[model samples]
Target chain A: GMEADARSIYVGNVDYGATAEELEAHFHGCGSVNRVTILCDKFSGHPKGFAYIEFSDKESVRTSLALDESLFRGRQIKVIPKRTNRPG
Target chain B: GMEADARSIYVGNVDYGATAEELEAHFHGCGSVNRVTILCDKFSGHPKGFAYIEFSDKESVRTSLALDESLFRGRQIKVIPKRTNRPG
Candidate 1:
Protein backbone atom coordinates (compact mmCIF):
# COMPACT_ATOMS: atom_id res chain seq x y z
CA GLY A 1 0.00 0.00 0.00
CA MET A 2 1.09 3.55 -0.67
CA GLU A 3 0.14 4.17 2.94
CA ALA A 4 -0.69 7.93 3.03
CA ASP A 5 -0.61 10.65 0.43
CA ALA A 6 -1.73 14.26 0.65
CA ARG A 7 -2.25 16.85 -2.03
CA SER A 8 -0.21 19.98 -1.52
CA ILE A 9 -0.64 23.62 -2.47
CA TYR A 10 1.40 26.80 -2.61
CA VAL A 11 0.08 29.81 -0.77
CA GLY A 12 1.95 33.05 -1.25
CA ASN A 13 1.84 36.62 0.04
CA VAL A 14 0.48 35.45 3.38
CA ASP A 15 0.79 37.94 6.22
CA TYR A 16 3.90 37.48 8.30
CA GLY A 17 1.72 37.54 11.38
CA ALA A 18 -0.63 34.85 10.11
CA THR A 19 -0.56 31.61 12.02
CA ALA A 20 -1.08 28.08 10.75
CA GLU A 21 -4.18 27.72 12.88
CA GLU A 22 -5.67 30.78 11.25
CA LEU A 23 -4.90 29.46 7.80
CA GLU A 24 -6.37 26.09 8.62
CA ALA A 25 -9.55 27.71 9.87
CA HIS A 26 -9.77 29.86 6.76
CA PHE A 27 -9.57 26.80 4.57
CA HIS A 28 -11.85 24.64 6.66
CA GLY A 29 -14.63 24.94 4.14
CA CYS A 30 -12.39 23.60 1.41
CA GLY A 31 -11.59 20.18 2.82
CA SER A 32 -9.89 18.17 5.51
CA VAL A 33 -6.38 19.46 6.16
CA ASN A 34 -3.56 17.00 6.68
CA ARG A 35 -0.87 19.48 7.60
CA VAL A 36 0.04 23.18 7.46
CA THR A 37 3.65 24.08 6.85
CA ILE A 38 4.69 27.71 6.96
CA LEU A 39 8.07 28.32 5.41
CA CYS A 40 10.32 30.66 7.34
CA ASP A 41 13.65 32.23 6.64
CA LYS A 42 16.33 29.98 7.93
CA PHE A 43 18.52 32.78 9.19
CA SER A 44 16.09 35.53 10.04
CA GLY A 45 13.54 33.02 11.34
CA HIS A 46 10.73 35.05 9.77
CA PRO A 47 8.06 34.10 7.30
CA LYS A 48 9.68 33.83 3.88
CA GLY A 49 6.56 35.17 2.18
CA PHE A 50 4.71 31.89 1.59
CA ALA A 51 3.53 28.60 3.05
CA TYR A 52 2.21 25.19 2.08
CA ILE A 53 -0.97 23.43 2.99
CA GLU A 54 -1.44 19.71 2.60
CA PHE A 55 -4.93 18.36 2.39
CA SER A 56 -6.33 14.88 2.66
CA ASP A 57 -7.73 14.70 -0.85
CA LYS A 58 -6.76 16.02 -4.28
CA GLU A 59 -10.09 17.78 -4.64
CA SER A 60 -9.19 19.88 -1.65
CA VAL A 61 -6.26 21.35 -3.53
CA ARG A 62 -8.56 22.56 -6.29
CA THR A 63 -10.95 24.06 -3.81
CA SER A 64 -8.12 25.78 -1.99
CA LEU A 65 -6.79 27.20 -5.24
CA ALA A 66 -9.95 29.28 -5.53
CA LEU A 67 -8.74 31.24 -2.52
CA ASP A 68 -6.18 33.12 -4.55
CA GLU A 69 -6.24 36.87 -3.96
CA SER A 70 -8.39 36.28 -0.91
CA LEU A 71 -7.77 38.18 2.29
CA PHE A 72 -5.82 36.50 5.08
CA ARG A 73 -4.72 38.52 8.05
CA GLY A 74 -5.70 41.68 6.14
CA ARG A 75 -3.42 40.84 3.22
CA GLN A 76 -4.33 39.41 -0.15
CA ILE A 77 -2.83 35.94 -0.46
CA LYS A 78 -1.88 33.95 -3.54
CA VAL A 79 -2.82 30.29 -3.88
CA ILE A 80 -1.61 28.01 -6.62
CA PRO A 81 -1.03 24.30 -7.02
CA LYS A 82 2.29 23.34 -5.54
CA ARG A 83 4.62 22.44 -8.34
CA THR A 84 7.30 19.85 -8.03
CA ASN A 85 10.25 21.41 -6.26
CA ARG A 86 13.29 22.24 -8.33
CA PRO A 87 15.48 21.80 -5.31
CA GLY A 88 15.06 21.70 -1.65
CA GLY B 1 -12.87 83.31 -6.01
CA MET B 2 -13.98 81.10 -3.16
CA GLU B 3 -10.89 78.86 -2.89
CA ALA B 4 -9.31 75.81 -4.37
CA ASP B 5 -10.75 72.57 -3.05
CA ALA B 6 -9.87 68.95 -3.46
CA ARG B 7 -11.72 65.76 -2.61
CA SER B 8 -9.85 63.51 -0.24
CA ILE B 9 -9.69 59.77 0.40
CA TYR B 10 -8.42 57.62 3.23
CA VAL B 11 -6.16 54.72 2.33
CA GLY B 12 -5.50 52.43 5.23
CA ASN B 13 -3.08 49.57 5.80
CA VAL B 14 -0.80 50.95 3.14
CA ASP B 15 2.67 49.55 3.18
CA TYR B 16 5.00 51.82 5.05
CA GLY B 17 7.41 51.46 2.15
CA ALA B 18 4.95 52.88 -0.40
CA THR B 19 5.85 56.36 -1.64
CA ALA B 20 3.66 59.31 -2.62
CA GLU B 21 4.94 59.25 -6.18
CA GLU B 22 4.08 55.57 -6.49
CA LEU B 23 0.61 56.21 -5.10
CA GLU B 24 0.00 59.07 -7.50
CA ALA B 25 1.07 56.90 -10.40
CA HIS B 26 -1.18 54.08 -9.26
CA PHE B 27 -4.19 56.38 -9.13
CA HIS B 28 -3.33 58.25 -12.33
CA GLY B 29 -6.04 56.49 -14.31
CA CYS B 30 -8.60 57.47 -11.68
CA GLY B 31 -8.22 61.26 -11.98
CA SER B 32 -6.08 64.31 -11.57
CA VAL B 33 -3.91 64.11 -8.51
CA ASN B 34 -3.92 67.17 -6.31
CA ARG B 35 -1.65 65.90 -3.54
CA VAL B 36 -0.57 62.69 -1.86
CA THR B 37 0.17 62.85 1.83
CA ILE B 38 1.63 59.86 3.64
CA LEU B 39 1.01 60.21 7.33
CA CYS B 40 3.93 59.77 9.64
CA ASP B 41 4.23 59.41 13.37
CA LYS B 42 5.24 62.64 15.07
CA PHE B 43 7.39 60.81 17.56
CA SER B 44 8.72 57.90 15.52
CA GLY B 45 8.58 59.79 12.20
CA HIS B 46 7.39 56.58 10.58
CA PRO B 47 4.26 55.80 8.63
CA LYS B 48 1.35 55.54 11.10
CA GLY B 49 -0.60 53.02 8.96
CA PHE B 50 -2.49 55.30 6.59
CA ALA B 51 -2.32 58.24 4.21
CA TYR B 52 -4.48 60.75 2.42
CA ILE B 53 -4.95 61.27 -1.30
CA GLU B 54 -6.34 64.52 -2.60
CA PHE B 55 -7.93 64.68 -6.03
CA SER B 56 -8.79 67.77 -7.95
CA ASP B 57 -12.40 66.67 -8.42
CA LYS B 58 -14.94 64.67 -6.45
CA GLU B 59 -15.36 62.19 -9.30
CA SER B 60 -11.73 61.24 -8.92
CA VAL B 61 -12.30 60.39 -5.28
CA ARG B 62 -15.16 58.13 -6.26
CA THR B 63 -13.05 56.50 -8.91
CA SER B 64 -10.22 55.97 -6.48
CA LEU B 65 -12.61 54.39 -4.05
CA ALA B 66 -12.99 51.52 -6.47
CA LEU B 67 -9.47 50.48 -5.62
CA ASP B 68 -10.45 49.12 -2.24
CA GLU B 69 -8.63 45.90 -1.41
CA SER B 70 -6.35 46.59 -4.34
CA LEU B 71 -2.78 45.48 -4.31
CA PHE B 72 -0.16 48.08 -3.49
CA ARG B 73 3.37 47.10 -2.66
CA GLY B 74 2.48 43.45 -2.25
CA ARG B 75 -0.27 44.24 0.24
CA GLN B 76 -3.99 44.78 -0.10
CA ILE B 77 -4.94 48.34 0.84
CA LYS B 78 -8.20 49.87 2.02
CA VAL B 79 -9.64 52.84 0.18
CA ILE B 80 -12.46 54.90 1.60
CA PRO B 81 -13.80 58.44 1.40
CA LYS B 82 -12.10 60.51 4.02
CA ARG B 83 -14.47 61.25 6.86
CA THR B 84 -14.63 64.58 8.63
CA ASN B 85 -12.04 64.70 11.36
CA ARG B 86 -13.33 63.62 14.75
CA PRO B 87 -10.18 64.20 16.77
CA GLY B 88 -6.53 65.04 16.30
Candidate 2:
Protein backbone atom coordinates (compact mmCIF):
# COMPACT_ATOMS: atom_id res chain seq x y z
CA GLY A 1 0.00 0.00 0.00
CA MET A 2 1.16 3.56 -0.73
CA GLU A 3 0.38 6.78 1.11
CA ALA A 4 0.14 10.27 -0.31
CA ASP A 5 -0.42 13.76 0.97
CA ALA A 6 -4.03 12.97 0.27
CA ARG A 7 -4.03 9.76 2.19
CA SER A 8 -7.75 10.16 2.77
CA ILE A 9 -10.69 10.10 0.38
CA TYR A 10 -13.57 12.52 0.34
CA VAL A 11 -16.91 10.79 -0.03
CA GLY A 12 -19.68 13.05 -1.24
CA ASN A 13 -23.49 12.72 -1.19
CA VAL A 14 -23.58 10.11 1.52
CA ASP A 15 -26.80 9.15 3.22
CA TYR A 16 -27.44 11.06 6.43
CA GLY A 17 -27.63 7.83 8.37
CA ALA A 18 -24.35 6.36 7.14
CA THR A 19 -21.85 5.38 9.82
CA ALA A 20 -18.09 5.04 10.15
CA GLU A 21 -18.31 1.33 10.72
CA GLU A 22 -20.19 0.88 7.47
CA LEU A 23 -17.77 3.03 5.51
CA GLU A 24 -14.76 1.26 6.95
CA ALA A 25 -16.11 -2.10 5.96
CA HIS A 26 -17.15 -0.92 2.54
CA PHE A 27 -13.60 0.14 1.65
CA HIS A 28 -11.84 -2.87 3.12
CA GLY A 29 -11.51 -4.33 -0.34
CA CYS A 30 -9.34 -1.39 -1.36
CA GLY A 31 -7.06 -1.71 1.66
CA SER A 32 -6.96 -1.43 5.38
CA VAL A 33 -8.86 1.52 6.76
CA ASN A 34 -6.67 3.56 9.03
CA ARG A 35 -9.54 5.68 10.21
CA VAL A 36 -13.04 6.71 9.22
CA THR A 37 -14.16 10.11 10.40
CA ILE A 38 -17.78 10.87 9.71
CA LEU A 39 -18.27 14.52 10.47
CA CYS A 40 -21.13 15.12 12.86
CA ASP A 41 -22.87 18.19 14.20
CA LYS A 42 -20.94 20.21 16.69
CA PHE A 43 -24.11 20.62 18.73
CA SER A 44 -26.11 17.43 18.17
CA GLY A 45 -23.35 15.09 16.89
CA HIS A 46 -25.40 13.77 13.98
CA PRO A 47 -23.91 12.80 10.63
CA LYS A 48 -23.47 15.79 8.30
CA GLY A 49 -23.78 13.30 5.42
CA PHE A 50 -20.09 13.44 4.47
CA ALA A 51 -16.92 11.84 5.75
CA TYR A 52 -13.18 11.22 5.35
CA ILE A 53 -11.94 7.74 4.75
CA GLU A 54 -8.22 7.26 5.43
CA PHE A 55 -6.48 4.26 4.04
CA SER A 56 -3.22 2.66 5.10
CA ASP A 57 -1.51 3.88 1.92
CA LYS A 58 -1.90 5.83 -1.30
CA GLU A 59 -2.56 2.75 -3.40
CA SER A 60 -5.80 2.23 -1.52
CA VAL A 61 -6.80 5.81 -2.16
CA ARG A 62 -6.34 5.32 -5.88
CA THR A 63 -8.20 2.06 -5.73
CA SER A 64 -11.04 3.78 -3.93
CA LEU A 65 -11.06 6.66 -6.40
CA ALA A 66 -11.79 4.23 -9.17
CA LEU A 67 -15.01 3.65 -7.32
CA ASP A 68 -16.11 7.24 -7.79
CA GLU A 69 -19.81 7.61 -8.54
CA SER A 70 -20.23 3.99 -7.57
CA LEU A 71 -23.64 3.08 -6.23
CA PHE A 72 -23.74 2.91 -2.51
CA ARG A 73 -27.14 2.79 -0.89
CA GLY A 74 -28.96 3.68 -4.10
CA ARG A 75 -26.97 6.85 -4.71
CA GLN A 76 -24.13 7.47 -7.13
CA ILE A 77 -21.46 8.66 -4.71
CA LYS A 78 -18.44 10.81 -5.51
CA VAL A 79 -15.17 9.56 -4.05
CA ILE A 80 -12.16 11.77 -4.57
CA PRO A 81 -8.91 12.68 -2.91
CA LYS A 82 -9.29 15.03 0.00
CA ARG A 83 -7.94 18.46 -0.78
CA THR A 84 -6.50 20.96 1.66
CA ASN A 85 -8.00 23.91 -0.09
CA ARG A 86 -11.57 24.34 -1.21
CA PRO A 87 -12.04 25.35 -4.83
CA GLY A 88 -12.56 29.06 -5.34
CA GLY B 1 -44.01 30.28 1.28
CA MET B 2 -43.24 30.14 -2.42
CA GLU B 3 -42.08 26.71 -3.45
CA ALA B 4 -40.67 25.66 -6.81
CA ASP B 5 -39.72 22.50 -8.66
CA ALA B 6 -36.25 23.00 -7.23
CA ARG B 7 -37.47 23.91 -3.82
CA SER B 8 -34.77 21.83 -2.25
CA ILE B 9 -31.17 23.02 -2.01
CA TYR B 10 -28.05 21.01 -2.65
CA VAL B 11 -25.42 21.82 -0.06
CA GLY B 12 -21.88 20.74 -0.94
CA ASN B 13 -18.48 20.71 0.77
CA VAL B 14 -20.19 20.45 4.10
CA ASP B 15 -18.15 19.36 7.07
CA TYR B 16 -18.70 15.72 7.74
CA GLY B 17 -19.53 16.56 11.32
CA ALA B 18 -22.24 19.04 10.47
CA THR B 19 -25.80 17.91 11.20
CA ALA B 20 -29.26 18.49 9.78
CA GLU B 21 -30.39 20.08 13.03
CA GLU B 22 -27.59 22.60 12.88
CA LEU B 23 -28.21 23.21 9.20
CA GLU B 24 -31.92 23.75 9.88
CA ALA B 25 -31.19 26.10 12.73
CA HIS B 26 -28.60 27.94 10.67
CA PHE B 27 -31.07 28.55 7.86
CA HIS B 28 -34.18 29.12 9.96
CA GLY B 29 -34.06 32.83 9.18
CA CYS B 30 -34.58 32.11 5.49
CA GLY B 31 -37.75 30.10 6.07
CA SER B 32 -39.17 26.96 7.55
CA VAL B 33 -37.43 23.74 6.65
CA ASN B 34 -39.64 21.09 5.16
CA ARG B 35 -37.13 18.26 5.27
CA VAL B 36 -33.36 17.71 5.44
CA THR B 37 -32.04 14.61 3.81
CA ILE B 38 -28.30 14.12 4.34
CA LEU B 39 -27.09 11.54 1.85
CA CYS B 40 -25.52 8.45 3.43
CA ASP B 41 -23.94 5.22 2.30
CA LYS B 42 -26.32 2.36 1.69
CA PHE B 43 -24.00 -0.21 3.22
CA SER B 44 -22.36 1.73 6.05
CA GLY B 45 -24.99 4.44 6.25
CA HIS B 46 -22.40 7.15 6.89
CA PRO B 47 -22.90 10.66 5.53
CA LYS B 48 -21.47 11.46 2.10
CA GLY B 49 -20.89 15.09 3.27
CA PHE B 50 -23.69 16.71 1.27
CA ALA B 51 -27.44 17.10 1.79
CA TYR B 52 -30.77 18.20 0.36
CA ILE B 53 -32.57 20.91 2.29
CA GLU B 54 -36.17 21.48 1.34
CA PHE B 55 -37.51 24.91 2.14
CA SER B 56 -41.12 25.98 2.45
CA ASP B 57 -40.72 28.12 -0.67
CA LYS B 58 -38.48 29.10 -3.55
CA GLU B 59 -37.53 32.41 -1.99
CA SER B 60 -35.88 30.57 0.83
CA VAL B 61 -33.96 28.46 -1.62
CA ARG B 62 -32.72 31.62 -3.33
CA THR B 63 -31.87 33.11 0.01
CA SER B 64 -29.92 30.00 0.80
CA LEU B 65 -28.08 30.20 -2.47
CA ALA B 66 -26.80 33.59 -1.42
CA LEU B 67 -25.38 31.91 1.65
CA ASP B 68 -23.30 29.58 -0.47
CA GLU B 69 -19.65 29.56 0.56
CA SER B 70 -20.76 30.88 3.91
CA LEU B 71 -18.84 29.53 6.83
CA PHE B 72 -20.52 26.84 8.85
CA ARG B 73 -18.46 24.88 11.37
CA GLY B 74 -15.40 26.57 9.90
CA ARG B 75 -15.94 25.22 6.39
CA GLN B 76 -17.04 27.25 3.38
CA ILE B 77 -20.21 25.48 2.30
CA LYS B 78 -21.83 25.40 -1.12
CA VAL B 79 -25.59 25.85 -1.46
CA ILE B 80 -27.39 25.40 -4.77
CA PRO B 81 -30.73 24.21 -6.07
CA LYS B 82 -31.08 20.46 -6.23
CA ARG B 83 -30.86 19.38 -9.84
CA THR B 84 -32.63 16.36 -11.30
CA ASN B 85 -29.82 15.70 -13.77
CA ARG B 86 -26.14 15.32 -13.03
CA PRO B 87 -23.76 17.53 -14.97
CA GLY B 88 -22.16 15.64 -17.86
Candidate 3:
Protein backbone atom coordinates (compact mmCIF):
# COMPACT_ATOMS: atom_id res chain seq x y z
CA GLY A 1 0.00 0.00 0.00
CA MET A 2 2.77 2.43 0.89
CA GLU A 3 6.18 2.69 -0.76
CA ALA A 4 9.07 1.82 1.49
CA ASP A 5 10.43 5.14 2.66
CA ALA A 6 13.88 3.94 3.66
CA ARG A 7 15.60 0.75 4.70
CA SER A 8 16.90 0.62 8.30
CA ILE A 9 17.94 -2.15 10.62
CA TYR A 10 14.85 -3.52 12.32
CA VAL A 11 15.33 -4.43 16.00
CA GLY A 12 11.81 -5.38 16.94
CA ASN A 13 11.55 -7.99 19.69
CA VAL A 14 12.91 -6.38 22.84
CA ASP A 15 12.12 -6.29 26.55
CA TYR A 16 10.06 -3.41 27.81
CA GLY A 17 12.63 -2.72 30.53
CA ALA A 18 15.33 -2.51 27.84
CA THR A 19 17.93 0.12 28.63
CA ALA A 20 20.75 1.63 26.61
CA GLU A 21 23.15 -0.74 28.33
CA GLU A 22 21.25 -3.86 27.25
CA LEU A 23 21.05 -2.65 23.66
CA GLU A 24 24.77 -1.87 23.61
CA ALA A 25 25.63 -5.24 25.10
CA HIS A 26 23.68 -7.06 22.41
CA PHE A 27 24.70 -4.91 19.40
CA HIS A 28 28.28 -4.39 20.58
CA GLY A 29 28.98 -8.02 19.82
CA CYS A 30 30.23 -6.70 16.45
CA GLY A 31 31.52 -3.09 16.82
CA SER A 32 31.45 0.25 18.60
CA VAL A 33 28.04 1.84 19.17
CA ASN A 34 27.90 5.48 18.16
CA ARG A 35 24.49 6.70 19.33
CA VAL A 36 21.66 4.88 21.08
CA THR A 37 18.51 7.00 21.09
CA ILE A 38 15.30 5.60 22.53
CA LEU A 39 12.24 7.58 21.64
CA CYS A 40 9.82 8.09 24.54
CA ASP A 41 6.52 9.75 25.22
CA LYS A 42 6.59 13.51 24.59
CA PHE A 43 5.08 13.92 28.11
CA SER A 44 5.73 10.99 30.56
CA GLY A 45 8.76 10.00 28.45
CA HIS A 46 8.67 6.22 28.62
CA PRO A 47 10.62 3.94 26.32
CA LYS A 48 8.67 3.39 23.12
CA GLY A 49 8.80 -0.06 21.54
CA PHE A 50 12.25 0.44 19.89
CA ALA A 51 15.45 2.34 19.94
CA TYR A 52 17.73 3.53 17.11
CA ILE A 53 21.16 1.92 17.20
CA GLU A 54 24.11 3.06 15.08
CA PHE A 55 27.11 0.79 15.36
CA SER A 56 30.37 2.66 15.79
CA ASP A 57 31.69 0.86 12.71
CA LYS A 58 30.06 -0.43 9.56
CA GLU A 59 31.35 -3.93 10.33
CA SER A 60 29.28 -4.08 13.50
CA VAL A 61 26.25 -2.80 11.60
CA ARG A 62 26.82 -5.44 8.96
CA THR A 63 27.18 -8.12 11.58
CA SER A 64 23.90 -7.09 13.17
CA LEU A 65 22.10 -7.17 9.81
CA ALA A 66 23.44 -10.59 8.88
CA LEU A 67 22.16 -12.06 12.12
CA ASP A 68 18.58 -13.26 12.11
CA GLU A 69 16.10 -10.75 13.51
CA SER A 70 14.44 -12.31 16.53
CA LEU A 71 12.97 -11.65 19.91
CA PHE A 72 15.22 -10.36 22.68
CA ARG A 73 14.13 -10.08 26.33
CA GLY A 74 10.72 -11.42 25.29
CA ARG A 75 10.07 -8.80 22.57
CA GLN A 76 10.43 -9.26 18.82
CA ILE A 77 13.74 -7.97 17.34
CA LYS A 78 14.54 -6.19 14.09
CA VAL A 79 17.97 -4.60 13.44
CA ILE A 80 18.72 -2.35 10.47
CA PRO A 81 20.51 0.89 9.60
CA LYS A 82 18.64 4.12 10.16
CA ARG A 83 17.10 5.43 6.98
CA THR A 84 15.85 9.04 7.28
CA ASN A 85 17.26 11.37 9.90
CA ARG A 86 14.82 11.62 12.81
CA PRO A 87 12.29 14.43 12.38
CA GLY A 88 13.26 17.56 14.25
CA GLY B 1 30.06 27.95 29.01
CA MET B 2 28.31 25.89 26.36
CA GLU B 3 24.82 27.23 25.73
CA ALA B 4 21.79 24.95 25.81
CA ASP B 5 21.60 23.29 22.40
CA ALA B 6 18.00 22.12 22.39
CA ARG B 7 14.98 24.31 21.70
CA SER B 8 16.49 25.90 18.59
CA ILE B 9 14.78 27.27 15.49
CA TYR B 10 16.27 27.29 11.99
CA VAL B 11 15.16 30.57 10.33
CA GLY B 12 17.66 30.90 7.55
CA ASN B 13 18.57 34.01 5.54
CA VAL B 14 17.31 36.23 8.31
CA ASP B 15 18.31 39.87 8.63
CA TYR B 16 21.45 40.21 10.73
CA GLY B 17 19.61 42.45 13.19
CA ALA B 18 16.61 40.18 13.66
CA THR B 19 15.18 39.87 17.17
CA ALA B 20 13.04 37.20 18.79
CA GLU B 21 9.99 39.45 18.66
CA GLU B 22 10.40 40.18 14.98
CA LEU B 23 10.82 36.55 14.25
CA GLU B 24 7.69 35.78 16.25
CA ALA B 25 5.67 38.38 14.37
CA HIS B 26 6.68 36.95 11.02
CA PHE B 27 5.58 33.46 12.00
CA HIS B 28 2.40 34.38 13.89
CA GLY B 29 0.43 34.29 10.65
CA CYS B 30 1.04 30.60 10.33
CA GLY B 31 -0.76 29.72 13.61
CA SER B 32 -0.45 29.73 17.34
CA VAL B 33 3.16 29.17 18.26
CA ASN B 34 4.06 26.62 20.90
CA ARG B 35 7.73 27.44 21.05
CA VAL B 36 10.24 29.32 18.88
CA THR B 37 13.94 28.59 19.11
CA ILE B 38 16.76 30.44 17.36
CA LEU B 39 20.30 29.13 17.33
CA CYS B 40 23.19 31.48 17.95
CA ASP B 41 26.93 31.17 18.26
CA LYS B 42 28.39 30.42 21.67
CA PHE B 43 30.86 33.31 21.67
CA SER B 44 28.81 36.30 20.47
CA GLY B 45 25.23 34.90 20.57
CA HIS B 46 24.27 36.18 17.16
CA PRO B 47 21.38 35.09 14.98
CA LYS B 48 22.34 32.08 12.83
CA GLY B 49 19.81 33.14 10.12
CA PHE B 50 17.92 29.85 10.28
CA ALA B 51 15.52 29.47 13.20
CA TYR B 52 13.11 26.76 14.41
CA ILE B 53 9.49 27.70 14.77
CA GLU B 54 7.03 25.15 16.19
CA PHE B 55 3.44 25.66 15.27
CA SER B 56 1.09 25.18 18.21
CA ASP B 57 -1.30 23.29 16.00
CA LYS B 58 -0.85 20.95 13.06
CA GLU B 59 -2.67 23.52 10.94
CA SER B 60 0.22 25.95 11.25
CA VAL B 61 2.58 23.26 10.17
CA ARG B 62 0.43 22.74 7.10
CA THR B 63 0.09 26.48 6.45
CA SER B 64 3.81 27.17 6.51
CA LEU B 65 4.53 24.20 4.32
CA ALA B 66 2.09 25.53 1.74
CA LEU B 67 4.09 28.70 1.15
CA ASP B 68 6.46 28.48 -1.77
CA GLU B 69 10.11 28.58 -0.89
CA SER B 70 11.58 32.02 -1.51
CA LEU B 71 13.48 34.96 -0.12
CA PHE B 72 12.25 36.44 3.13
CA ARG B 73 13.83 39.35 4.94
CA GLY B 74 16.39 39.44 2.10
CA ARG B 75 17.36 35.81 2.55
CA GLN B 76 16.19 32.47 1.20
CA ILE B 77 13.65 30.89 3.54
CA LYS B 78 13.04 27.20 4.05
CA VAL B 79 10.29 26.38 6.56
CA ILE B 80 10.35 22.93 8.06
CA PRO B 81 8.25 21.29 10.78
CA LYS B 82 10.95 21.64 13.43
CA ARG B 83 14.51 20.68 14.19
CA THR B 84 14.79 17.08 15.40
CA ASN B 85 17.79 15.78 13.42
CA ARG B 86 20.37 17.65 15.52
CA PRO B 87 22.63 15.52 17.68
CA GLY B 88 21.89 15.28 21.35
**Cα deviation in Å at residue B48, candidate 3?**
28
lDDT per residue, candidate 1, A1-88, as tens digits?
1212237777887543554557677788998876565542221233344667777788898888789999987778888777645332
Each prediction's Cα RMSD?
Answer: 18.1, 12.0, 14.3
Fraction of the native A-B contacts that model 2 recovers: 0.04
Candidate 2 lDDT score at position A18: 60
Q: Pick the candidate with the highest TM-score.
A: 2
lDDT by residue for model 3 over B1-88, one digit each (tens)?
A: 0122222234555433443345556666776654443332211233343455655565666677654365565556776545446544
Ranking by DockQ: 2, 3, 1
Would you give the TM-score of chain B in model 3? 0.60
* Candidate 2 vs. true structure, TM-score: 0.44
Model 1 stretches with alpha carbons more than 4 Å out:
A1-6, A42-47, A84-88, B1-88
DockQ per candidate = 0.01, 0.05, 0.03
CA displacement after TM-score superposition, residue B88 of candidate 3 (Å): 18
Considering only chain B, report the TM-score of each candidate against the true chain B.
0.77, 0.75, 0.60
Tens digits of per-residue lDDT, candidate 2, A20-73, equal 556776787998776665543322343335667877787788899888888876
lDDT-superior candidate, 2 or 3: 2
